Amino acid sequence: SHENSNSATEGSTINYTTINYYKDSYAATAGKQSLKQDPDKFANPVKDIFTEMAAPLK
Amino acid sequence: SHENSNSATEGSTINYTTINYYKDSYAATAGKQSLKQDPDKFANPVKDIFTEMAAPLK
Amino acid sequence: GFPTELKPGTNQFLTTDDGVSAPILPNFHPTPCIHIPGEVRNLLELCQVETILEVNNVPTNATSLMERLRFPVSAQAGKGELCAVFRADPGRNGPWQSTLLGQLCGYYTQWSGSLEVTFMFTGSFMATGKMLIAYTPPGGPLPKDRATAMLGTHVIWDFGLQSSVTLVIPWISNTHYRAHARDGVFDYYTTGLVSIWYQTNYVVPIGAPNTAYIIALAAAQKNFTMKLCKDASDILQTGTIQ
Amino acid sequence: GFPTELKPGTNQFLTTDDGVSAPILPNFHPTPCIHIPGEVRNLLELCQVETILEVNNVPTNATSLMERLRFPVSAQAGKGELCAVFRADPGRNGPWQSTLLGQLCGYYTQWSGSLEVTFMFTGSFMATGKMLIAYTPPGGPLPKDRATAMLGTHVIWDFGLQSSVTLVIPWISNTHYRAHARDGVFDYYTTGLVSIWYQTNYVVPIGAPNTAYIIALAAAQKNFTMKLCKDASDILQTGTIQ
Amino acid sequence: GFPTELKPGTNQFLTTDDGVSAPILPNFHPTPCIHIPGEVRNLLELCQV
Amino acid sequence: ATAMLGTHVIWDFGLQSSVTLVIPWISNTHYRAHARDGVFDYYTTGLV
Amino acid sequence: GDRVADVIESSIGDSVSRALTHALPAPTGQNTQVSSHRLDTGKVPALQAAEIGASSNASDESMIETRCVLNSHSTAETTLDSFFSRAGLVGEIDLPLKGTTNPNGYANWDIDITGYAQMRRKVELFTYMRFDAEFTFVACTPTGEVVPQLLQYMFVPPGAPKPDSRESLAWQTATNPSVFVKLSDPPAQVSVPFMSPASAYQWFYDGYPTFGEHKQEKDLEYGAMPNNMMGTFSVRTVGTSKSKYPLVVRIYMRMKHVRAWIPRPMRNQNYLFKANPNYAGNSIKPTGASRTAITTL
Amino acid sequence: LLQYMFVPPGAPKPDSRESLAWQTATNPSVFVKLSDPPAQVSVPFMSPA
Amino acid sequence: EIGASSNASDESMIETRCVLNSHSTAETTLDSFFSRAGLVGEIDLPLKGTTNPNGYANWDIDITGYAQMRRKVELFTYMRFDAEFTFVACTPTGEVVPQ
Amino acid sequence: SDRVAQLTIGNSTITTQEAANIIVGYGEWPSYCSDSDATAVDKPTRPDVSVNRFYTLDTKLWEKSSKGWYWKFPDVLTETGVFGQNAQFHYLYRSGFCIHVQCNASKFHQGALLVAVLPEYVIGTVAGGTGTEDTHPPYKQTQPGADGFELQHPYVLDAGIPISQLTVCPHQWINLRTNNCATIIVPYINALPFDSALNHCNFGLLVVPISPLDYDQGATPVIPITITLAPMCSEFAGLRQAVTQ
Numbered sequence A, B: 001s002h003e004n005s006n007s008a009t010e011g012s013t014i015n016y017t018t019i020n021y022y023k024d025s026y027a028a029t030a031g032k033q034s035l036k037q038d039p040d041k042f043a044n045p046v047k048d049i050f051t052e053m054a055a056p057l058k
Numbered sequence C, D: 001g002f003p004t005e006l007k008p009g010t011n012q013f014l015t016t017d018d019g020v021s022a023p024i025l026p027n028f029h030p031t032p033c034i035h036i037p038g039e040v041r042n043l044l045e046l047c048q049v050e051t052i053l054e055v056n057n058v059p060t061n062a063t064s065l066m067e068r069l070r071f072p073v074s075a076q077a078g079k080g081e082l083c084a085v086f087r088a089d090p091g092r093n094g095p096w097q098s099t100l101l102g103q104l105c106g107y108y109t110q111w112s113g114s115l116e117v118t119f120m121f122t123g124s125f126m127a128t129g130k131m132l133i134a135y136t137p138p139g140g141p142l143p144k145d146r147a148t149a150m151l152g153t154h155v156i157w158d159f160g161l162q163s164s165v166t167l168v169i170p171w172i173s174n175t176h177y178r179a180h181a182r183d184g185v186f187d188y189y190t191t192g193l194v195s196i197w198y199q200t201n202y203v204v205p206i207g208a209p210n211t212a213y214i215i216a217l218a219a220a221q222k223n224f225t226m227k228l229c230k231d232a233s234d235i236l237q238t239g240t241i242q
Numbered sequence E: 001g002f003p004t005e006l007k008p009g010t011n012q013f014l015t016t017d018d019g020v021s022a023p024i025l026p027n028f029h030p031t032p033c034i035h036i037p038g039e040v041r042n043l044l045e046l047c048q049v
Numbered sequence F: 001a002t003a004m005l006g007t008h009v010i011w012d013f014g015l016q017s018s019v020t021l022v023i024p025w026i027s028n029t030h031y032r033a034h035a036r037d038g039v040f041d042y043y044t045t046g047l048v
Numbered sequence G: 001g002d003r004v005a006d007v008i009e010s011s012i013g014d015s016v017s018r019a020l021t022h023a024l025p026a027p028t029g030q031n032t033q034v035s036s037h038r039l040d041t042g043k044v045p046a047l048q049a050a051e052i053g054a055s056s057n058a059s060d061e062s063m064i065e066t067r068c069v070l071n072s073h074s075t076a077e078t079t080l081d082s083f084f085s086r087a088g089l090v091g092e093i094d095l096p097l098k099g100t101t102n103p104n105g106y107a108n109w110d111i112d113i114t115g116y117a118q119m120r121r122k123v124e125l126f127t128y129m130r131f132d133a134e135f136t137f138v139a140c141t142p143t144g145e146v147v148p149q150l151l152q153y154m155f156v157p158p159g160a161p162k163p164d165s166r167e168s169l170a171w172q173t174a175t176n177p178s179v180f181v182k183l184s185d186p187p188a189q190v191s192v193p194f195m196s197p198a199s200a201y202q203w204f205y206d207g208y209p210t211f212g213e214h215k216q217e218k219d220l221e222y223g224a225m226p227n228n229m230m231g232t233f234s235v236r237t238v239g240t241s242k243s244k245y246p247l248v249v250r251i252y253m254r255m256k257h258v259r260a261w262i263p264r265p266m267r268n269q270n271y272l273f274k275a276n277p278n279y280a281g282n283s284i285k286p287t288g289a290s291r292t293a294i295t296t297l
Numbered sequence H: 001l002l003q004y005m006f007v008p009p010g011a012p013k014p015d016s017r018e019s020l021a022w023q024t025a026t027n028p029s030v031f032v033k034l035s036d037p038p039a040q041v042s043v044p045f046m047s048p049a
Numbered sequence I: 001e002i003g004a005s006s007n008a009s010d011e012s013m014i015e016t017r018c019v020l021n022s023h024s025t026a027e028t029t030l031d032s033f034f035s036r037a038g039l040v041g042e043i044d045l046p047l048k049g050t051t052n053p054n055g056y057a058n059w060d061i062d063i064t065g066y067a068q069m070r071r072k073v074e075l076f077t078y079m080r081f082d083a084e085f086t087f088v089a090c091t092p093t094g095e096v097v098p099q
Numbered sequence J: 001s002d003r004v005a006q007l008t009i010g011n012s013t014i015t016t017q018e019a020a021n022i023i024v025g026y027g028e029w030p031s032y033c034s035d036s037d038a039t040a041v042d043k044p045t046r047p048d049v050s051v052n053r054f055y056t057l058d059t060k061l062w063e064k065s066s067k068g069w070y071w072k073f074p075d076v077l078t079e080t081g082v083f084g085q086n087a088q089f090h091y092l093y094r095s096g097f098c099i100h101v102q103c104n105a106s107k108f109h110q111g112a113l114l115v116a117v118l119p120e121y122v123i124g125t126v127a128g129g130t131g132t133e134d135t136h137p138p139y140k141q142t143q144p145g146a147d148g149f150e151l152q153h154p155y156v157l158d159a160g161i162p163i164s165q166l167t168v169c170p171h172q173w174i175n176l177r178t179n180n181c182a183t184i185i186v187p188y189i190n191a192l193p194f195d196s197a198l199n200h201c202n203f204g205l206l207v208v209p210i211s212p213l214d215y216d217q218g219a220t221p222v223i224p225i226t227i228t229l230a231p232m233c234s235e236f237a238g239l240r241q242a243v244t245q
């Protein structure tokens, strides 16, 4: 379509498939989000990574 | 479409993207305007322009 | 008929809804539009035009209202004297309300950009002087002396053949936009302060007036934009308009 | 007009309906989004982060609440003594309510996947010991002794330079998903039990404390997912929030 | 708005109407279907027993 | 708290028994003469 | 130009956020691979060091003998929009005939969604959130009856004049957006953009909005974030004469196009006040249930 | 005006017309008037089986 | 005195960094500013009264009777536009009756 | 090789022979603000070595009965060194931090501290005990300076949230039988590109004993906890006179 880029997610590393009937994109449906995850950001934010087989503190 | 050119903006140096379901164009949505500006018309309407670096009254 | 199902919002009249409405006059054609000088396309075009800033917003009696448009300078007997001060907040009550920028600002909740104030000296050709105009960013209290004002953004102005000087109030904010600042928690959005000091002195020879006036003109820079259209704080009517 | 016909559902407001609504501010543009560290994309990212499991969920007086975060071990005088026990059901009242996993679990009716509990020993460097941590799948009653616990899934943990050990509670279910287990027929969905026994003994030399504590950290494995979004069992307000 | 006009039948609930209704759980995914013996596809399969 | 504002090393006792504190050449002149009480304190290196 | 070596080999000004981790697609739960017995020295997946700050990296396969399981279980319902794009109550406005509160046919509600616990606890799982929203307005009498009454809803951004009567000139609404709807119509519903001057709304702001001494008198401003203050929602019955009916307006919000940053521990004590985390010191409760001993269920 | 709410196992069941549970921040709810046509929604296959 | 506004910019008055400005100018177009419906007229049709007491009224079209709208349009001398008119009717208490 | 470490920044070097790796908060290193995220137009000042260096600010004594403490950033440093001066003379500030918490005992002592960084750490009050009074925490409690402040109710972190879930934040543990320090690198976290170092604390540092300190009578009973930290990639803008509040 030919609307404005009003949505709160314009420039998000994940892309959506939404529906809209208005010139402003924030009026659009929530749609579908891509299913990417990065748990290491929270669960394993160590500088020097350690493998599963080794002893963590060597 | 195949309507009449009834709009108040027919012949405007700026073009719009509107929606309409009637034969008269003035029934259309406001749409989007192009984003051109000419501030000099009001802020700098001098006959002989002067640059930023020079002394205005020489 | 084709199966449809009505959703919430049905029958509401939203005043900002951009829809299509049945035309009352079919096949009607408007009077053509001839060329008319001065067409404006964006309010930002008007924000860049300087209008008079009422730094001297003190007299209120109807016969002295014109005095609000100019402020004075005169021979000081000494050093680093304060001449005038005002807040740089464009959409706040005070000096800026006299400017078109200030007024247009009233129709928007948020703004962003640099401002500029141009000061024109209107004393006699024989009068000289140097002034220090300073802009104090958020957090700095009103400078007590010229020595603390001088630590912020400033211009030292020399009177001369070029009658005016421009003080740019650069956009120095923590947020990308500011809402209109006011006393209380919204002071979070204050732009800061402008103060004018005597750098040397207003000097004149025998025969020229000892007092002269400065006129301030304010406007926005090209990086200035506004967002979130809203109604202005004033409504200029008391009862019904007849 | 184009022929249409209204169907049931017309005018209803379904709170989970993903529709389109008229925008209140035409041509409005949001403040740009700068880079902010720590963006989360899926709740499952949080379920994999270990949080403290309150195995010792017994003291309730406000001054002893911190004691819930750790449980003890000490020199036993003998053999195969029981140290602690708890249900492995993540969305059931009990120890898991202290974990973020437990809490996020509350917003979903069903879950599936393996869990893991990591136990960190916090005694002195001079203290040694071996513990047997067992997971008993559904149907097995609380083991009366170490000899019956040892028949289920288990880890024999040796204290040493690596302070911690992980007990994986593998997904061993009859159904693809489990709903939250509770007393009664929904015990059909129980995950089972975890029991900790002394494999040998907590041993220490002269000069080191006779009691030490273990801290348990729990989370889900990568095969863990949840479905059927629902409201959590708790609503944290009594009257109106002022 | 786009011009429409309501026809008879509007608002009725016909129990055999095969229509579309708003889903209550967005993005919900069902438990997969494993193989189960004895699936029937048509009642006529039972009439022959 | 005031010592910590200069050049410093935080030393942890452990298997490596020692630590080295480097006193980097931080002088106004290219060379220093021997410092002593009086005007030649101009050449002092500083304190540890 | 820069001639001294240290200026040339300087990293001052590096604006690239160097990230140690990256997102991978993950539409289903992870599968399980076949594993067998391992009787080996040196390799030890079960042993960890929680002090490091990371979660355990041990998997099912390395702790017990596993079969192969092909896992098709979807991860779609735990995306932020799945979790948050569900409308919940965030406001309630009373317009009674006789009363102490809003007795004159109009009311001004400062927009704040922290007055209701279900919604508040969910959003506070994160520190920063950026999203668009759909607002639905359900109006009726206090018994839930529908009466033939016309209402006006107006959004009043900060700095716009707030109405002070059912006849305020502000209701001319020449620039503010207003919705005129009948109680007999379906609930009014509109889309709202992300409006903060900041890049995100933040449920927690550890600071003060202004400079100065922070004397006890003005401590009610600790944690006050003007960036979350979006304005006022004003409602009135449309008339110069009082309405014949007592009314109630319930406000529902549904977030969409959601982004969130910085997860935090979830609320474990009852909420007492709006936008402030005070809890009852005399009634600090354990996060969950208790039992009599650590050795019995 | 009525409110219908689906309460999955483990979600708090309302115990009064004023229960806090009616805030329905996650459960799906339908608000409909008796004067409107019958409310209607689609439900997925929800068993753990 | 020339009549122009200052041409001095931030860059020439202080030392500036580079700022890439993505802030939109779309909301200050004339349609953004004016294409919002505001009250421009009010007509009373009372039962007993001095004004329009006989079930009908004639209103000369003039939008200058209400200040919010009037002040905005008077920012300009000449204006050319199309318009959408909406008519909201009810009793003086805001009640809806079968009329 | 995971246990030994040296951190050198500015004219300061820290050593440890009993480390447990390094945590980089949210897996992201600190960086300067880009030209596209920035909004303020004045050229910033980036003092470098004179402000990005380790400052040892305080020592607490760990006692068998200790509750735990917190410090607020950048509050702890606004009155220290050249960093403090810049934070005072400028309206805008931004930086990341390298935090190094120190605590050594002996192979016969025991206990475990949780060292965590919680962004936007808003403090709550007990609301007059009954929960009927909307009281607020005073300035000395929200911004305690270099002294830090002791937690009154560690279980709910003086803010109605469970310390049991604090590990969802960048953290390390100092478990005496294992290590004697915690090192956390934190990038600048805010919803704005720059902010006031005085009015806003971007995050709080929490040091809380979870497994209490213990030892037999006769072993050194004074076990200090020292906090050393270093700003990283500091930038300042919006210059004027010096201000402390």
Ligand SMILES: CCCCCCCCCCCCC/C=C\[C@H](O)[C@H](N)CO
Pocket (backbone or CB within 6 Å): D024, G111, G112, G113, G114, G133, G135, G153, G154, G155, G177, G178, G179, G190, G192, G195, G201, G202, G203, G228, G229, G230, G233, G275
């Ligand atoms: C014509 C009707 C329009 C109604 C307009 C509603 C605008 C609502 C904007 C969403 C704001 C999100 C909530 C923001 C902040 C929180 O409530 C608190 N202030 C946090 O302290």
Ligand SMILES: CCCCCCCCCCCCC/C=C\[C@H](O)[C@H](N)CO
Pocket (backbone or CB within 6 Å): C024, I061, I062, I063, I064, I083, I085
């Ligand atoms: C079936 C209902 C149709 C209603 C027709 C409304 C036509 C209105 C035309 C717009 C006129 C714009 C206002 C023009 C002039 C000003 O009000 C004043 N005369 C200025 O002095």
Ligand SMILES: [Cl-]
Pocket (backbone or CB within 6 Å): C089, C090, C091, C092, C179, C180, C181
């Ligand atoms: Cl302002």
Ligand SMILES: [Cl-]
Pocket (backbone or CB within 6 Å): D089, D090, D091, D092, D179, D180, D181
């Ligand atoms: Cl469960």
Ligand SMILES: [K+]
Pocket (backbone or CB within 6 Å): C019, C020, C021, C022, E001
């Ligand atoms: K229409």
Ligand SMILES: [K+]
Pocket (backbone or CB within 6 Å): D001, E005
């Ligand atoms: K027709």
Ligand SMILES: [K+]
Pocket (backbone or CB within 6 Å): C001, D005, E007, E008, E009, E010
């Ligand atoms: K039909």
Ligand SMILES: [K+]
Pocket (backbone or CB within 6 Å): G028, G029, G030, G031, G070, G071, G072
């Ligand atoms: K899979």
Ligand SMILES: [K+]
Pocket (backbone or CB within 6 Å): I020, I021, I022
């Ligand atoms: K640009």
Ligand code: NA
Pocket (backbone or CB within 6 Å): A051, A052, A053, A054, A055, A056, G044, G045, G046, G047, G048
């Ligand atoms: Na391992």
